[PDB]
Structures are given as structure tokens and as C-alpha cells.
Structure 1
Amino acid sequence: AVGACVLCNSQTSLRCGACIRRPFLCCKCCYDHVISTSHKLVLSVNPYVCNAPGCDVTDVTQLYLGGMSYYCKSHKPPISFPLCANGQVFGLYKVTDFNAIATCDWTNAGDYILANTCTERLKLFAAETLKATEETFKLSYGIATVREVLSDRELHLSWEVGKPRPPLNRNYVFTGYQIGEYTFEKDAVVYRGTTTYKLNVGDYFVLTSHTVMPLSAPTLVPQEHYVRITGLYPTLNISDEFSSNVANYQKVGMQKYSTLQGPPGTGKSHFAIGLALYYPSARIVYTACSHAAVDALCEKALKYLPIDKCSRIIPARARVECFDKFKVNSTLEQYVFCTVNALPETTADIVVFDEISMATNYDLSVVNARLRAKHYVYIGDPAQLPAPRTLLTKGTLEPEYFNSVCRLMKTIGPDMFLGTCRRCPAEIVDTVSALVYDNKLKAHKDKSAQCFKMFYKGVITHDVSSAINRPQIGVVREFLTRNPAWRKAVFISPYNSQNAVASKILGLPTQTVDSSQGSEYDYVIFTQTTETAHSCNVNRFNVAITRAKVGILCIMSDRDLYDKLQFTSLEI
């Protein structure tokens, strides 16, 4: 019942009973909170409530201290002081931003803007409060029950009435009843179970709302600049392959934390693995939010680092199939590859946190709490996709508000910038360089002359709110008959329902823009599907077109983005 104030760190016996995270508030801050919000319950050793029998006064502003006890205006003794007086709430040991975080419902972009522009302690309060709200929102969804099992990949579901149905894609992960985690995609629904289990009738699925633990560490440790490389020992025999990053690797050792902005195909994994070769005796923990990003770092390490000095940390509750070529769960290996949520409590010479646009401040804080490091390297790209904000429905979240690292990269600039895209045909590099990189991204490849664009709005239908554009898929099918080399293409769209329709009509492998991030293919076929804020988002557009190594076909709905594509236009 005694701790440090979230706002001014002052010692207090007071916590807000109305905040969902019950934060410590000092006398001055507790007062400014209760006096400006609907939050009137204050908790000390005991709640500040009227102690008189049967009384219901709990509002701190209507309460008084009568001896060692609390009473309202109606039950107070003649000798009593108000609990709220002279800008303070009475307590042992004797804000506009805090109030907005404490009372917002997290449905507006302004809520996330504030959560990233506030003090460091309020960033943790906002992250914990937000994450708690997001988990309690998972309880709002209805239970799915097996009505009938059709096959090994298809079944029929009966939903709970009165409660809304969660969107059906790979982002929404259910728990069966615990018969393993399950995902669903569109009466016959397609199911995918983590554990191969014979689906029984009457079995039910719920999105597993986990308990949000409190945060302790900052999103970023205080910056420290050094005169020399600190705690790290450079090689004098650095391979030519990594020579381009030697100045950047030295910058890494000369400051507590460093940020690396790496546009698509500019060498992010190459940089991360090269850091190990440049400081060969340094113990590095490689982390990312997703198993996929951690696996991509494992792939690069498998090529350049000694396999016996690596370990892939996999939590006992395996939620996906991941990297198999390293010794599993050997926390003490020189190179540890592990998702943020599975990080052990350990130390490191360098912590490399990859795909930083996908991290939340909650993730930034967890990394700082589990890992004590000499150096922290944040690698990613604020021009790429952020983590989905399931509660956010009003407004667009700009890259400078994705998290603390993205905020720094967009305001003061990244510490390091990989400026040459080695993946994409020049038409793609030139389009995205002008679009999101202020013309600082350069092409290594020539123009492929295999980048096409077609302006075709088609017809937009909807599987609930997920969009489908059958005429856009029809245009693709027509193009494929005339361009058989594109048979090997990956179909990409901003919607899973569009991808499900394209998978049946085209037979191409399918991928959403959000699930394509970090991946690359020779040929990409993209159908914009709609003109929505979602399908027109420049970071999503950036990711979509930068998946291509050789060619891309963009079937566009939006005039602006279509005109910005430096591609050959097709007719029909």
C-alpha cells in the first residue's frame, strides 16, 4: 500500500481506486487527479470511504479525517479535516497528461499520441493501462462452439448471441476446450489447430486474454555517449562482406543505445549478424516480437556464426513451428535468439531488437526489464507496418507514435540509416524512396521493366468488413494468361477475404501486406481491393510493393498511389 508516485516519484500511501492499474499518486498528484476526473475512490492502507455504518460515501472530495478514521459531511465529528484540501489528498509522506491516459478508452489515435509524447513514467502507465484494456476487450467477444465437424480442415461454428464475433483471420488466435491453440478463416469455416486434434462436437473456442503484468523498466534506458568503444572488443580481421558497417558497429559500442533505420532489403539482418563478427567475444541476445522475425535472424546467423554458440529460446507452450537448427533453450549460449514475450532474465554485451516498428512500448519496457545490457540496438523501419492496435478505430496512428524508438527515428532521426536497397527493381525503389524516405533510399538493381500498374476500381464486396474485389482478381487472371512467367507470383492484398477469393480463382500463394512484411518474392501481384484508409496507408503500400525482387503488378483503386507508382501502365 506504499510506493512511488507515477507522476513525480514522491513517496505515497495513496493509489487511485478508479484507475484500472491502481497507480501510486502522491498527495499533490492524487488531488489533481480526483479534482479533474470522474475518479474519486482513493485507496491507502484501507479505502478512503465513510466508516459510518451503512454509509455509501466513497468520493474522496466528500470525505474527512475524524481521528484516525474517515467520514462524509453527514457523519463527521466536529473535529475533522477534509481529505481534499490545499491542493492535496491527505496521506502519509506529505497531470493533465496522466488524467487523459487514466480515463481514455484507447479508441482514438490521440490516446496513442499522448502515450508516446508524455514522460517516461507515464509511457509505462499508458502501456500497462492500454494493454489491460486490450485484454479486457478480448472478453467482449462471443464463444464459438462446434456445431458439426466437416473435415480435417473445415467445420461449422455456432456463435454466442448478444456478444460480437471476433474477426476471422490469423491475427485472432483462439484456445480450444486446453486442446491447443486454433485459428479460423471463412457457412463452412476453415480451421487450423496448433496441435493436430480430432475436432469433437461441442468443443468451444475463446481468445485467451492473458494477465497484463506491471512494467518497471523504461521503454529506453537513459542515453549514454562514450569517448571510446565500451565493454566490446573489435576484430582487426573484419570480413569485406561486413566492411560497409564498420563505422556503424563502432557507433554501436560508443553509446548505450542506437537506432538503425533499414528500408526494405537494405541489409538489416546482415548488419545484426555482422555486429557479432565485429565484436567476436560479445554475448548477443537477438530479440523481436514475432517468431518469424526471430527465425529470420537465426537464418542469417546459421550462415555466418558458429552454430554451437547459438540457441533458439522456445517457450514450453509452442504456439507456432519455429527455428530447429540451434540447441533449444540454452540461455547461456553466446548467441540467444528469442521473442520478447519469452525472454529470460539475463545479461548481454549487446541486445539487438529487430523489426522495431512492430514493437509496442510494453515490449520496449519488457526487454529493458529482462535484459541488462552494455548496448541496445534497435533495428527496424518506421516506414513499415506497426503492431495492430485492436482498440484503435478513430484516427490514423503516425510512425512517430508507434513506440519510443520510432518516435526518436522520426523526430531526431535514426543513429544509422542503411541507404541502398539491394532487393527491388529500381522502379520500386524510386517510388518508395520518394513516398516514405525523403528521397534517401537508393536502388542497387537496375529497372527490371517488369513493374506494372493498372488503374481498375472493380467492384467491392465485403465478408463482414474484410473487402473483396472479384473484378480486380479477374484482371489478374487475364494478365496471367498473357504473362505465364508470373505463374510463380505471390498474390498480396490488404485483406484476407480478397486473398481467400484469389487463392481459389488464381491458385497463387497468398499473403496479406501485414503478413508479407520481412519476406521477399521474385514476383508479386497486388490488388489494392478498396479505397480505404487501410488500403491507402503509405506504410502498408511501402511494404506491399517492396516484397518484389524482380517484378510486380499493382491493380490500383486509389488515383494518388497509382500515379505515384513509377511503373509501366497497362490498359483495360
Structure 2
Amino acid sequence: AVGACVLCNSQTSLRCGACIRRPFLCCKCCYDHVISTSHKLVLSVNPYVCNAPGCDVTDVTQLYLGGMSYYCKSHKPPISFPLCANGQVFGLYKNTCVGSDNVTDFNAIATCDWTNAGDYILANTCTERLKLFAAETLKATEETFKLSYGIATVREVLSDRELHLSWEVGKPRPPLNRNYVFTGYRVTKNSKVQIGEYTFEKGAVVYRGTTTYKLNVGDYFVLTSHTVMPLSAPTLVPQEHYVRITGLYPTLNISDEFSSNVANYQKVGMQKYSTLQGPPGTGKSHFAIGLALYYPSARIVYTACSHAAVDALCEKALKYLPIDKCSRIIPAVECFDKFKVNSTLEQYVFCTVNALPETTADIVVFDEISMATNYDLSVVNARLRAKHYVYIGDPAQLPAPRTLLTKGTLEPEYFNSVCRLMKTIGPDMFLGTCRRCPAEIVDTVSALVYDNKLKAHKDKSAQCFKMFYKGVITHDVSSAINRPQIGVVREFLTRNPAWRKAVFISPYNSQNAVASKILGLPTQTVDSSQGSEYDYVIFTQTTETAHSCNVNRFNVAITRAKVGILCIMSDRDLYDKLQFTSLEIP
């Protein structure tokens, strides 16, 4: 009941009747919320409505406070004083209220459909708590506009990986790839019954098996969502550098295999938070282990948004240093049970943004912070009250798709809370680790956005592929299948012997789904190639209008290779000075 309106710094019991999150607005604050826009309904400890039987008044501007109750205008016992009067709304804290100078914060960003770029613009032009309200409202609008599409179901079953699928009544269908997991429920007569986790991309309906299934009649698959609760801890911690190396457990040996570790070790010695801007091969592979060995007993927590990217470190986090000192817990969802699972007690707790309880910790070393709003930062800073932070990440690592984009692409810097801070105050560490990624990618990628931080560490043997091509497009309701650069990729792989050991990633899974029918290259998604980076690669774009060929949405997915790459680009923007070997079409 009693929450907090903070812009006016006013405890409140009121809330707007028709709004996004039942937001909390004080007396004068609810007033200029209900006169600057149209929100003529409020909720208190009890809702304001005439109490005579059969009466109906939604409005509050004409209700009266009667005999320990509320009465109204059309049906009027008016022995009272009006509820809305004298620049205020009747409630508790009617005296200890301040008001708002910026009248149109809610009136600007809580009044639109939460999809324009102006929402995020103002969210970055906010305070910590105001931008917390912003991030929670973005999660709320994500779920509330995801719960407006259909539910897939299999009513007569066919052979697995090739079924039939009817959907729903009149609703449209969302995008097509494995972004939306079709994990619904089955109904016997009134109850919900074990179903499993599914995903629909190819349709005759070809399914990808997150598990092996024996589908029965009627089985329904759809994401059923709850609402993210309000959070009680700030996302970012204010920048305060340490007086000394007091309270640390120093070691005697110094890392040697890593050539950019000692100065950054000292930095962690007197740095409180740490974020950098890097593609694969930026210390995310070895520097975490470097800190792990350089301070043994420090409570250091790691996390990636999916377990297959936590695995990229955890696979040898138990080999480089003893097993007894790491863990991450697996809920049951694709998660890897390598470590000591169902064990809160550990030292180097690996984690996933989706789930981890809170006991205690002291040092933060968290991986990518990309595909979520301030929820990711806040849940992990609430997870532990830490003395040191390392926010490994990038505003372009896996930039959060803004659901149904309608109005352009915003500046990459404007991420949750730290990426705009990031290159306005400078990178937190001196760190570049190009021991897998070669210089052929580094040249272009660092000349574009990551200036002078990553090194041209490894040379190339003039095998990088160029072929001038414009291309033609053909789109579907939720994806697109490519004629021309797909054919050119085919006839290119028919020229070189040792090129059929690559990946076939796709902007939407439809490309590899169609290709599996006649060649059969493995399925790959642009969603998250979690901790799985390989040298030889076949990249494809099909349709690239606003999600692909705009900014560094996947310029890290252009950092594919180690000694050789393929990166198909059907536009004429990201080639300005790229010098791939010029060879003619066959």
C-alpha cells in the first residue's frame, strides 16, 4: 500500500488507475498527472467510487468523501467536501508533499506506446531511480506486447522434426527464429500437464528439439509470462576509488602467459568498477582466470546470459585452478551441469542472469551486459554487496533487440547505465587480448568503433574472401530466404576443398532450415553463439534493412575468425576501406 514517489520525495498510498505499472504519484503529483494528460481514475488503500448499490462513476474529479465512504455527482448526497480540490488529491501525506518541476516525465514517456526512441532518449536523460522506473517499464511493455500474439499447438502429430501446426484465432504471429521459446502446457480436461520446451522455425512443420518428445493430441506451446517485480537496489555503484590495497589477500607469483595482466591486476587493486568495450578476444577468455589465480580467496562472481557462454570460461575454470572453488546452479532449460550444482557455498560462483540467490560476495567480475535493460545490472548488484566490480561487456556485444523496432536505431553508447558513461569517462582497464581474433577483422572493426584499443596481433595469409555483389531479396511474414548470395556461397564453397568445415549462421533460422534440406549444414542462430567462436565461417544476411546493416549490431559476429573468414555483405556501407582479396564472380 504505502510505497514511494521520489521525484517529489513523497511517500504515497495513491496510484494512477489507468497506467503502465500502477505508478505511484503523490497528491499534487497525481494532480499534474491527471491534468497534463487524461488519467481520470486513481487507486488508494480503497478505490474511489460511489458506494451506493447500483451506482457507477469512474471519474474522481467529482466524487465526495461522505460518511466514512465516497459518493458522486450524478447520484449526489453532497454533504461533504470534494475529493479533488486545491491543487491536490485527498489522501495520506497530503501535507508532506513537494511536487514536480518537470511536469511531463510520465506525461511524455508513460503516455506513448513504449516503442519510440524518445522513451530511451529520456531514459538516458534521467536519474538513477527515474531510469530504474524506465527500465522496469520497458520490461513491462516487452511482456505486455508479447502477450498479444498466438499460441501454437499440435493437434494431430507426425514424425518428429516434421509435424503439422495450427495456431490461434485472428492474432498475428511474432518473428520466426528460436528467439521465442514455445514452452506451453498440455490440458487433459481442466488441468495443465507436462509438455517440455519447443521452438518453431521451419514449416509440414520442422521443429528443433531442445528435448526429445512424444507429442500427443492438442499439445499447446506458447510463452506464458509473469511480470518482473520492482527491484530494491541500484544498478550501478557510484565511482569511488580505493584509498589503498587494504583488505586484499595478495599473492607472490605474477602471471606471465598473459602479457597485459599485471597493470590491470593493480587496477583491480584500486578500481571499484570495471567495464571495457571489446569483441571476442578481449580478456573475457583468460583475464577472468588471471584474476582468479592472482587473488585466490576473493569472492569473485561470474555470469553470462546463457549457460553456454558461462561454459566458455567454466570449462577450464576448474582446470586452471582447483575444482573446489567454482559453481553455477542449473534450473529445470539449456544449462550445463559441469560445476558443483545445487551448491550455494563456493568461492568463484559462476551465474546466469536468469537465476541466482543472494548470500554474500566481495568482488564482481561479470561478463556481457548486453541483451537486457538495467534489470541485469541491478539484479547482480543486489545479488552481492561487493568491494570490487568488473563489468565485462560491450554496448555492441549482443545489443538487446528492441522488440518490434519502428523508428530507427539509437546510438550504441546509450545502453543501460554504464555504456554511455563508458566512453565519456574512459575505459576502466587497459586491456586488449587478440590471441584468437586476427588483424583482418581488427583493422575494420577498430577503425569503425573500437578505436586503438585492440591490437593487430596476428597476420593473414591472403585467404580472406571478397566478391562484389549487389543481390536480390525475398522476404516472408517473419523471416526471409536468400537466392543470390546463398547461391554465390554455394558455388564459392564448390571451389575450395577445405571450406566445408564452417558454420551457417542466419539472421533468422529459416536460412539454415531451408539449406538443411539439400545440403545439411548445422543450425546456427544470430541470437547468441554463446561462448562458441570458431575460425572458418559462412555468414549470411538475406534481408538487411534496419536490424543488420546499420551499426555494430553484429560487428562482433564479424569477429568470427582466427586465421580466415567469410562475411557476406550485400550493401555498400561497411566496405569503405576494407581490403579483402578482390576476385571475380564464377
Provide the TM-score with structure 2 as the length reference: 0.90
How far did residue 158 of structure 1 move? 1.0
How far did residue 236 of structure 1 move? 2.8
Secondary structure in 1 aligned to 2:537?
strand
Aligned length: 568
Q: Deviations over 1:251-288 (max 9, x none)?
A: 33434422233333122232222222222111122122
- Residues 453 and 556, structure 1, Cα contact 8 Å, conserved in 2: no
- Residues 116 and 407, structure 2, Cα contact 8 Å, conserved in 1: yes
Identify which range, 373-382 or 70-79, moves more after superposition: 70-79
Identify which range, 75-84 or 358-367, moves more after superposition: 75-84
Identify which range, 52-61 or 234-243, moves more after superposition: 52-61
Q: Deviations over 1:121-141 (max 9, x none)?
A: 222222222222222333322
- Residues 178 and 509, structure 2, Cα contact 8 Å, conserved in 1: no
CA distance 1:64–1:439, change in 2 (3 Å): farther
How far did residue 41 of structure 1 move? 1.9
How far did residue 433 of structure 1 move? 0.7
How far did residue 430 of structure 1 move? 0.3
- Residues 382 and 410, structure 1, Cα contact 8 Å, conserved in 2: no
CA distance in 1, matches of 2:374, 2:228: 13
How far did residue 420 of structure 1 move? 4.5
How far did residue 432 of structure 1 move? 0.5
- Residues 351 and 375, structure 1, Cα contact 8 Å, conserved in 2: yes
How far did residue 149 of structure 1 move? 2.4
Q: Deviations over 1:442-485 (max 9, x none)?
A: 21001331211223233212232312212211111111121112
Q: CA RMSD, aligned part only?
A: 2.5
CA distance in 2, matches of 1:242, 1:8: 51
- Residues 201 and 207, structure 2, Cα contact 8 Å, conserved in 1: yes
CA distance in 1, matches of 2:39, 2:427: 40
CA distance in 1, matches of 2:478, 2:78: 63
CA distance 1:379–1:303, change in 2 (3 Å): same
How far did residue 348 of structure 1 move? 0.5
Partner residue, 1:118 = 126
- Residues 455 and 555, structure 1, Cα contact 8 Å, conserved in 2: no
Q: Deviations over 1:103-147 (max 9, x none)?
A: 332222222333333222222222222222222333322121214
CA distance in 1, matches of 2:200, 2:13: 48
- 1 or 2, which has the higher helix percentage? 1
CA distance in 2, matches of 1:215, 1:86: 34
How far did residue 355 of structure 1 move? 0.8
CA distance 1:234–1:89, change in 2 (3 Å): farther
How far did residue 97 of structure 1 move? 2.1
Identify which range, 383-392 or 547-556, moves more after superposition: 383-392
How far did residue 55 of structure 1 move? 4.0
CA distance 1:416–1:80, change in 2 (3 Å): farther
CA distance in 2, matches of 1:21, 1:80: 32
CA distance in 2, matches of 1:470, 1:411: 44
Identify which range, 28-37 or 428-437, moves more after superposition: 28-37
CA distance in 1, matches of 2:309, 2:410: 23
CA distance in 1, matches of 2:62, 2:237: 42
How far did residue 410 of structure 1 move? 4.1
Secondary structure in 2 aligned to 1:431?
helix
- 1 or 2, which has the higher strand percentage? 1
How far did residue 75 of structure 1 move? 5.6
- Residues 328 and 341, structure 2, Cα contact 8 Å, conserved in 1: yes
- Residues 6 and 24, structure 1, Cα contact 8 Å, conserved in 2: no
How far did residue 491 of structure 1 move? 2.4
CA distance in 2, matches of 1:84, 1:224: 46
How far did residue 176 of structure 1 move? 3.9
How far did residue 543 of structure 1 move? 1.9
Identify which range, 340-349 or 254-263, moves more after superposition: 254-263
CA distance 1:388–1:165, change in 2 (3 Å): same
Q: Deviations over 1:136-171 (max 9, x none)?
A: 333322121214322122211011131122333211
Q: Deviations over 1:399-427 (max 9, x none)?
A: 22331122222433331253353323322
CA distance 1:344–1:557, change in 2 (3 Å): same
How far did residue 54 of structure 1 move? 4.1
Mark the runs of 5 or more structure 1 residues left unpaired by the alignment.
Answer: none
- Residues 456 and 555, structure 1, Cα contact 8 Å, conserved in 2: no
- Residues 305 and 352, structure 2, Cα contact 8 Å, conserved in 1: yes
Partner residue, 1:466 = 479
How far did residue 339 of structure 1 move? 0.7
- Residues 157 and 216, structure 2, Cα contact 8 Å, conserved in 1: yes
Q: Deviations over 1:11-56 (max 9, x none)?
A: 2222222233223222232222222222222222212334455443
Structure 2 counterparts to residues 70-219 of structure 1, below 5 A: 70-73=70-73, 80-94=80-94, 95-177=103-185, 178-219=194-235
Identify which range, 492-501 or 174-183, moves more after superposition: 492-501
CA distance 1:176–1:92, change in 2 (3 Å): closer
Identify which range, 546-555 or 112-121, moves more after superposition: 112-121
CA distance in 2, matches of 1:523, 1:189: 31
